[PDB]
Enzyme design. Structure first.
Site, PDB file in Angstrom:
ATOM      1  N   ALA C  68       9.483 -47.498  19.247  1.00 54.16           N
ATOM      2  CA  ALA C  68      10.374 -46.977  18.226  1.00 54.16           C
ATOM      3  C   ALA C  68      10.958 -45.735  18.879  1.00 54.16           C
ATOM      4  CB  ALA C  68       9.604 -46.596  16.969  1.00 54.16           C
ATOM      5  N   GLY C 111       6.699 -50.558  18.806  1.00 56.04           N
ATOM      6  CA  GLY C 111       7.606 -51.285  17.920  1.00 56.04           C
ATOM      7  C   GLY C 111       8.221 -52.491  18.586  1.00 56.04           C
ATOM      8  N   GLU C 114       5.561 -55.381  18.440  1.00 54.80           N
ATOM      9  CA  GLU C 114       5.543 -55.799  17.056  1.00 54.80           C
ATOM     10  C   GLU C 114       6.723 -56.676  16.712  1.00 54.80           C
ATOM     11  OE1 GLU C 114       5.176 -51.717  15.474  1.00 54.80           O
ATOM     12  OE2 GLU C 114       3.243 -52.279  14.746  1.00 54.80           O
ATOM     13  N   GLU C 134       0.811 -46.462  20.322  1.00 51.60           N
ATOM     14  CA  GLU C 134       0.976 -45.548  19.203  1.00 51.60           C
ATOM     15  C   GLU C 134      -0.122 -44.479  19.088  1.00 51.60           C
ATOM     16  OE1 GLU C 134       1.449 -48.653  19.305  1.00 51.60           O
ATOM     17  OE2 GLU C 134       3.093 -49.299  18.047  1.00 51.60           O
TER      18      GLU C 134
END
Ligand SMILES: CC(=O)CC(=O)SCCNC(=O)CCNC(=O)[C@H](O)C(C)(C)COP(=O)(O)OP(=O)(O)OC[C@H]1O[C@@H](n2cnc3c(N)ncnc32)[C@H](O)[C@@H]1OP(=O)(O)O
Ligand SMILES: CC(=O)CC(=O)SCCNC(=O)CCNC(=O)[C@H](O)C(C)(C)COP(=O)(O)OP(=O)(O)OC[C@H]1O[C@@H](n2cnc3c(N)ncnc32)[C@H](O)[C@@H]1OP(=O)(O)O
Ligand SMILES: CC(=O)CC(=O)SCCNC(=O)CCNC(=O)[C@H](O)C(C)(C)COP(=O)(O)OP(=O)(O)OC[C@H]1O[C@@H](n2cnc3c(N)ncnc32)[C@H](O)[C@@H]1OP(=O)(O)O
Ligand SMILES: CC(=O)CC(=O)SCCNC(=O)CCNC(=O)[C@H](O)C(C)(C)COP(=O)(O)OP(=O)(O)OC[C@H]1O[C@@H](n2cnc3c(N)ncnc32)[C@H](O)[C@@H]1OP(=O)(O)O
Ligand SMILES: CC(=O)CC(=O)SCCNC(=O)CCNC(=O)[C@H](O)C(C)(C)COP(=O)(O)OP(=O)(O)OC[C@H]1O[C@@H](n2cnc3c(N)ncnc32)[C@H](O)[C@@H]1OP(=O)(O)O
Lengths: 260, 259, 260, 259, 260, 259
Positions: C68, C111, C114, C134
């Site tokens: 992200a 991200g 995912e 993360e």
């Protein structure tokens, strides 16, 4: 307190890794009530120790744990089991928030395999062996061996192992996802401590939330797991460590987590 | 006397009930008749006290190439719904004794599902698994989107179901669909040995264990563990549990009695 | 539409495959709000495009999506996250009925991992790497990294990946079932397009039923999954394609699907 | 030597273990100390072979007005999380013997949840139930959004949780939150009568039945029925089931022995 | 067939309602193996009967069914239960697609309560009584008495009923939602037949879909129940009856269902 | 410029957002247009910081009579599937602010479902609920077989869904489908008073509470309780919680700021 069946030690950098060694080699670490009572005391201790961020559970070179104590179960009756809540202190390890890594060397059979599977991560020695030989004693796995095993390895292998009592090697275990890493018998515990160290370096509160999130993959539908995960994710923003880890990434420096 | 299958009692002391699908001209396609017989044979070995485990197999070229397309061909949705189409297909899942599928050759469509319905799958070196239903304008209807996914993972399940592509014995084992691969010639023999080991254990306990393992797909881990514990407690209500444990302690061979 | 962060293309036979390419290489395809808003636009378009039967999502050779955008999360608080439904447009891809195949080359971290996992099928380049870093940032995966990963890879590897932030290779990912195929960096997208092409060749309505059935394996007990599946299976008999595909086998000819 | 509670063994043959929350000045607000003692009393009656059922009650004006707000007041999110805040609260849910809540007066917030944690709830005519946590800028933290909803339905649960409004004994019963309403004066006596009836039955069977009923909230109906069936089969492993059924057949009173 | 324990009859308008009466008053309709075997034969028959759209199950004025046959269970061992799949044919009624309405007059205890609860709808006579006295016999309910009861009545009343063996009246049962309607002892079966009549008036295929949808409310999360329901809802559009029922509303005339 | 609905900001401080279905010609039958506007209004009040609770209502004679039959009349199976028929119908379930349905008159078919999708249902004395879809050759398609069953029980749900019969406001309340009954005339006003109470509390905490209650239908009690505990801990990360708890201790009025 002073231990009869286990050896505890604080290892790794900054002594952030709490090592617990099952020390009852004469019975191949069979999990008698007393061994369990001490293991749980040691876990709770490391759990309450602010310097420890991860725990490493191991046995000896020959056996991680050969199972529950057959001698202690032999004279039990159905009524004893029921009213005496037989084996109820067995799954206390599952109440520990900090990560536990099982460093499995040798035999991890029956209650031993189940104890290893109760752990968050399993590292296996080159000579390790996993199995659920309960059926050979006229009983079935009683602490998750028909559940965690099946969930990791698949119905076919789980059925085969539980119904025949056959053992699988370290290799089959890794190939099947029961264990994530295989290391030489001699360097195994060291290697597991290395992994616990990395984890311990990270924020304790965030690590606890991550572990709680992963575990939820076995308690809900994907929809609800994702929602719970999102809620924990949002919660991390309520900590200083999240602030610190994100800012350090942006600021291209090393993060100084304070478990808060 | 069966038209579509061959039954035999094998293993030490005839403890293993072998069912062999025998409809090679149709590559063992699962027609209503075949299923009706399969279920008869299953119920029989289920009711036979000398049998502790069943081994299900087909031919060297095909375990089962799928449902019989010709018999589904003129079916309508109301036929399917009202006639409870394929309802007798999963009777095998009601059998308490363990069933091991010795899959040689093709195990496609309904054949793959039948194999997956079994407790353990052993595969021949030349075995192939797949769900080609999509190629026929239909989807798997007996657990091919469910048991496959749960054994193999979403990516491979989706790939297999959406393209109809086959995977090898090796891909199947690497993915956990099958737990053992054996040469085409020794496969059934090897599955019978596995079945023999199982039949040597206490039938009552083996039935409880199988029921416990199956529960891993029907409950949360918390409840699975609790059910498991309850069955575990139940084993203490049997003579075999007493025997099995005293034998260990008394350093002797346990003598089970399925009680 | 006129895209800042992505490149869309209609590829494959009869332009049946909708190719979406993350194109923000300077940030190694880091997922920012704008990238996501465009990704979702492109997804919805291919979704509404009758010619398109399957979608292929990919990034660059070096990275599918490295995470992200941390700068964007860096100043949020818990209440911002909660009240602002932070990351809620992230899982829109999961609402697309047409199959999506992720062609992962290079990094697919955070991200990015995912997003790849949200796809129905994952193909990986030889140099692909998956991971959930993360924890290194003081947070946890917030778009199914603790859920879909665990369900594909097992508890031990998922815990290890999520708790340490370590990456796994394309081979480890395939061995574990995270990805179903590995292809050379150069031919990866081409190979993924062949797969989507194969899928687009089939009836869309049936394919959408199948995909919905497979997904249900993570939302129900096997009993209910099998019953839903049976009901979808019966439903296929209400379509013209089911008839065509079955007649075609009987009549020994090629089926001519019409997505109806 | 309890500071916050009063324990007493009541009922025929002192078969009932009566726990009385005694902290009237704070309307029995559940402070850590009160909870630590409650848990001690529970574990004791649990381990007392003479006791077969427990009755939990407070005072005439309040069963329990909720968690101790003053003790929650300076807590932070990190404290709550890292400190496992309120984890000793649901210990009552680990007790195998039945617990009946005799709710007189206020049973609000943590008090309503404590009552809901019990197996059976009997309510005094003047009892009131509610979840006022929302009025404090927090939500129910020990099952108030869970057990309440499952007993009373979404509309009333949402209404009670979102507004903090109280419902009467009557509303609670009509909704199924409580199963019986009794005069303030005779309430505990009536709850002890119920616990007595429970204590006269086989302890092992009673524990199995309670475990089966609780499973109704942890599994699908299919699995709950399968678990129930397995516990049902287990009862045949006891002397009491033998006794119970023979007594019916032999036209005599059964003599249970909790075995 | 040649029934010893039950009386079957086809009642209502167009003989659409298949009536099943347990007729073993001497044992207050205790559910002996023979009675169950016949009950199941009668159910299967009405199920296969094109003119029957709904079934009404009832006993006598004094008792619907007082429970399983205690005399038949008395000599059973744990091993008999297990190996003999004890009570396996007990819930065959749950495999019937057409609706079954239980017209409970008098005692509906133990296996009798459970049988009534297995039914889709329960109508109760003014003098009916429900209960689970299994605990008084040293056993627990074994055909859903701890499951369906709890789900209909709530934990507190279920626990109370199951743990004490106490009976509840027709009114307590209705207030609690165990039964939806109470009728005088004499008109009860007539009333239940009227209800079965209305149901038999609608499309049988749609009615079967609806019943299967409502049942799913106990087998899935609300998210999945809603999705399954939506899929069944879409399925109704594949039938002529839906066409018919909807056109008839628009055309302001009477719907003419033909069960397909 | 709403064709089918009337929105208004009511309640003290204009904190309640009232949406009124206004298509009496077809007894508020839920046509696509009506739904599109309903969803717009919901999203608006959702994004409106002054609004803390929404009240949904229809007319005195009908809340909503169902989906528009004329619009569904020519749909096929492939239409429904490929076209994701009724997909925007449950958007109301995405709103995080509480929605209270003030049902006056008919609430049938899609209408009942819409009311049930709301968090709380208040009903007028002459209100009527039902699922007549079976009379049209179809079944409820927006939770009528799900939410109904969960609130009312299997027997009544089965009866309502299979016969198409209606139940009164009283039957609905007795059964827990609705939590309060009010005179036809004062109903909406009474619902607004409730919405006001909700609006008075912290919006963030209220949204957490509502999400927790809703979880009672998506998980086992164990997991629901765990999720609830996590939201509970989260409230400690807000200023509102600190405020609400200080207010009690400090015996003063809490002043929430929604964060
Ligand atoms: C709920 C549950 O989860 C229940 C269970 O696990 S119960 C059953 C699971 N475990 C078993 O069946 C394992 C049984 N043990 C074995 O098969 C063998 O010990 C082994 C193959 C693992 C090792 O073989 P080995 O090298 O020859 O060592 P072995 O001599 O058997 O064992 C060494 C000592 O440890 C004891 N021991 C090993 N496993 C034990 C166990 N599970 N319980 C108690 N003692 C055990 C052995 O009896 C022996 O002690 P003694 O000679 O003084 O009596
Ligand atoms: C709910 C469900 O679960 C539904 C389903 O499974 S249906 C779909 C699954 N099965 C299929 O799609 C079947 C596909 N079959 C094939 O592709 C091939 O049979 C094969 C690849 C398995 C083998 O190829 P092959 O060696 O060339 O054999 P092939 O000549 O094609 O077939 C041999 C005979 O068996 C028949 N057969 C094979 N599978 C069949 C099936 N599923 N149904 C009916 N007949 C079948 C073939 O039609 C042929 O019979 P005829 O020559 O008399 O018509
Ligand atoms: C996870 C969780 O689930 C957490 C919790 O439940 S949060 C608690 C929810 N409860 C509430 O919000 C407060 C409930 N209490 C009240 O509203 C009122 O006390 C009442 C309606 C119960 C009775 O009102 P009342 O008859 O006028 O008595 P009141 O003066 O308010 O209180 C009685 C005494 O006990 C104290 N008390 C009441 N509720 C208390 C609570 N929940 N915690 C601690 N002390 C409490 C009061 O402060 C007062 O003590 P002091 O006079 O020394 O300050
Ligand atoms: C899985 C399961 O779910 C298992 C079960 O339910 S097990 C037990 C549940 N059922 C019971 O406990 C029922 C016991 N029966 C009673 O208490 C009483 O019969 C009653 C309260 C229903 C009525 O009392 P009553 O009017 O005096 O009639 P009563 O004389 O007792 O019974 C009438 C006849 O039917 C028999 N009978 C009643 N219930 C029976 C049952 N459950 N099983 C077998 N026979 C039964 C009686 O023994 C008697 O027969 P005989 O006199 O020839 O021996
Ligand atoms: C997925 C889903 O969940 C789908 C659905 O719910 S299916 C629909 C469920 N609803 C029904 O079955 C419709 C029920 N409505 C009726 O039968 C009646 O309107 C009523 C019983 C509600 C009241 O009776 P009434 O007071 O005499 O009113 P009535 O004259 O029938 O209808 C009034 C007007 O509204 C219309 N109407 C009522 N309900 C309607 C609905 N659900 N859809 C469309 N139009 C409807 C009527 O057709 C009539 O319009 P016109 O005269 O201009 O043609």
């Amino acid at each position: 307190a002073n231990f009869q069946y286990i050896i505890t030690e604080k290892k790794g950098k900054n002594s952030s890794v709490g090592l617990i060694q099952l020390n009852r080699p004469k019975a191949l670490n069979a999990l008698c009530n007393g061994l369990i009572e001490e293991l749980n005391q040691a876990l709770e201790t490391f759990e309450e120790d602010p310097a420890v961020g991860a725990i490493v559970l191991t046995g000896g070179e020959k056996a991680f744990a050969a199972g529950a104590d057959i001698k202690e179960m032999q004279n039990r009756t159905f009524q004893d089991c029921y009213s005496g809540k037989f084996l109820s202190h067995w799954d206390h390890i599952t109440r520990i928030k900090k990560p536990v890594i099982a460093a499995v060397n040798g035999y991890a059979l029956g209650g031993g395999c189940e104890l290893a599977m109760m752990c968050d991560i399993i590292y296996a020695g080159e000579k390790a062996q996993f199995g659920q030989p309960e059926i050979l004693l006229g009983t079935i796995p009683g602490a998750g061996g028909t559940q965690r095993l099946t969930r990791a390895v698949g119905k076919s292998l789980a059925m085969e192992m539980v119904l025949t009592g056959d053992r699988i090697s370290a290799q089959d275990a890794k190939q099947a996802g029961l264990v994530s890493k295989i290391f030489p018998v001699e360097t195994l515990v060291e290697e597991a401590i290395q992994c616990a160290e990395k984890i311990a370096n990270n924020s304790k509160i965030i690590v606890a939330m991550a572990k709680e999130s992963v575990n939820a993959a076995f308690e809900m539908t994907l929809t609800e797991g994702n929602k719970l995960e999102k809620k924990l994710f949002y919660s991390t923003f309520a900590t200083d460590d999240r602030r610190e880890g994100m800012s350090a990434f942006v600021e291209k420096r090393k993060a100084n987590f304070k478990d808060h």
